[PDB]
Design a protein around this ligand. Structure first.
Ligand SMILES: CN(C)CCNS(=O)(=O)c1ccc(-c2cnc(N)c(C(=O)Nc3cccnc3)n2)cc1
Length: 277
């Protein structure tokens, strides 16, 4: 740690505090995450050094002296960008570029059997070039519940790569509407917010749902709403893709690979964001 000069705090993540820091030897500006150490964690974290992709924040070094992760420094997070763009909204071409790149990053991770499990605007990092990257990929294996897949909330112990698709669908809706899709403040409020918009799931739409650990027959039965009401500024291609990212059954939910082939991305481009740094 004597090699790093902390500049400022840049976040307080799930499993530790994130700092902007300067490497005293190279002059490199990095993000330093101090982990809140088991042998299993050291081995699991070391495998993440090899998981390199243009849409994944580069994990430069792992320092075990208690545990520090040295990441490449991006200039802004998507939460700050969304807040800065709240008056006019993020232009649709930029939303589509960001969604397409995040799907590319997810397709890469998922092909290597690596799940994020906690996607949220605060861990999506952007640069002046138009790139967007996934941060904290693989760390999991006030807490925000807004992006949690329904199978996690219902007690599924062995959830799949579909959880990340659900989280990215929620973020996509939020970029488009400028409001969080499901802003729950408890696990039950999060579940019931999902049910109120998408309909209470049953055996018809989600075979096996009624046998899930936390499913209760006593759940209220709400009807599903149309996506025209859910995401109005989003064209029909965007709405059909979103609906497939938010399918209740994780087995029916679109994969990142199939989502990349969706007609919504026929006219994808890579615009430059207007970033105020
Ligand atoms: C807290 N606010 C008020 C200040 C920082 N906001 S920001 O948008 O200017 C910002 C956010 C994040 C990063 C940054 C850069 N490179 C990184 N590599 C990371 C990073 O790894 N972040 C992260 C987030 C959550 C959990 N773990 C890591 N963050 C830089 C600027």
């Amino acid at each position: 740690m004597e090699n790093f000069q902390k500049v400022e705090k840049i976040g307080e993540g799930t499993y530790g505090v994130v700092y902007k820091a300067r490497n005293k030897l190279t002059g490199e500006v990095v993000a330093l995450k101090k982990i809140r150490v088991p042998s299993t964690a050291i081995r699991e974290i070391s495998l993440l050094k090899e998981l390199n992709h243009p849409n994944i924040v580069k994990l430069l070094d792992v320092i075990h002296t208690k545990l520090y992760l040295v990441f490449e420094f991006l200039h802004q997070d998507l939460k700050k960008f969304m807040d800065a763009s709240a008056l006019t909204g993020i232009p649709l071409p930029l939303i589509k570029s960001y969604l397409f790149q995040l799907l590319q990053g997810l397709a890469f991770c998922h092909s290597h059997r690596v799940l994020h499990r906690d996607l949220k605007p605060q861990n999506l990092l952007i640069n002046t070039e138009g790139a967007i990257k996934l941060a904290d990929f693989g760390l999991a294996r006030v807490v925000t519940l807004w992006y949690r897949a329904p199978e996690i909330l219902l007690g599924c112990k062995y959830y799949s790569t579909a959880v990340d698709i659900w989280s990215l669908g929620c973020i996509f809706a939020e970029m488009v509407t400028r409001r969080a899709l499901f802003p729950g403040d408890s696990e039950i409020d999060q579940l019931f917010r999902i049910f109120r918009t998408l309909g209470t799931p049953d055996e018809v739409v989600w075979p096996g749902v009624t046998s899930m650990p936390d499913y209760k027959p006593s759940f209220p039965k709400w009807a599903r709403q149309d996506f025209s009401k859910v995401v109005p500024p989003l064209d029909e291609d965007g709405r059909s893709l979103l609906s497939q990212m938010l399918h209740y059954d994780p087995n029916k939910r679109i994969s990142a690979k199939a989502a990349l082939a969706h007609p919504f991305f026929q006219d994808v481009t890579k615009p430059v964001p207007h970033l105020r740094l």
